[PDB]
């Protein structure tokens, strides 16, 4: 009866990790929906370009935080069991909740 989450920073890894979860969730459930989105976020920051003084010279860094609710059609006991051992590479973050 559970619900799922996927969170990342890479614009392609978010889909490659989706394509791991919705397949692990389909291997024990025949009815399909495909992935649902939201929420996406962005963030930018500045730093001094050199380690000693040089405080007028700076460089621009940014990130884009990607998240999917994904949705699972049958969250059945046999299907959540496959998600207790979810691997799925490093570089993303997930949840299982009720």
């Amino acid at each position: 009866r559970i619900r799922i989450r996927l969170k990342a920073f890479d614009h392609r890894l978010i889909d490659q990790a989706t394509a791991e979860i919705v397949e692990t969730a389909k291997r024990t459930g025949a009815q399909v929906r495909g992935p649902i989105p939201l929420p996406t976020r962005k963030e930018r920051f500045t730093v001094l370009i050199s380690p000693h003084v040089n405080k007028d010279a700076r460089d621009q860094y940014e990130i884009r935080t990607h998240l999917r609710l994904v949705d699972i059609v049958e969250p059945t006991e046999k299907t959540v069991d496959a998600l207790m051992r979810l691997d799925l590479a490093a570089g993303v973050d997930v949840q299982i909740s009720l």
Partner: protein, 100 residues
């Protein structure tokens, strides 16, 4: 910056999770609200704040690589003295040159 600065957090940061971030929310066990102008708790609470160095205060992250306190930025994961050399090596995930 000194080699002594690298382990200075070890006891401080541990008591931050243990007591220094909930002891005021749980204070009703070392307090009274029924007796007017009467103390039976101050000397046992001052005994709890008797130890030093480990405080709710005094707490600094530092650059664990050098001991340098200044120029720390949590959004970068690393203090700015080492950021360009680490980020151009590709060591910090996912920092890159892309500019504005």
């Amino acid at each position: 910056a000194k080699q002594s600065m690298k382990a200075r957090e070890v006891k401080r940061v541990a008591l931050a999770d243990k007591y220094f971030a909930k002891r005021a929310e749980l204070k009703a066990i070392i307090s009274d609200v029924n007796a007017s102008d009467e103390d039976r708790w101050n000397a046992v609470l001052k005994l709890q704040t008797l130890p030093r160095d480990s405080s709710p205060s005094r707490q600094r992250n530092r650059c664990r690589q050098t001991g340098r306190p200044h120029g720390f930025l949590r959004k970068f994961g690393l203090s700015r003295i080492k950021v360009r050399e680490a980020a151009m090596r590709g060591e910090i995930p996912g920092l890159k040159k892309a500019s504005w």
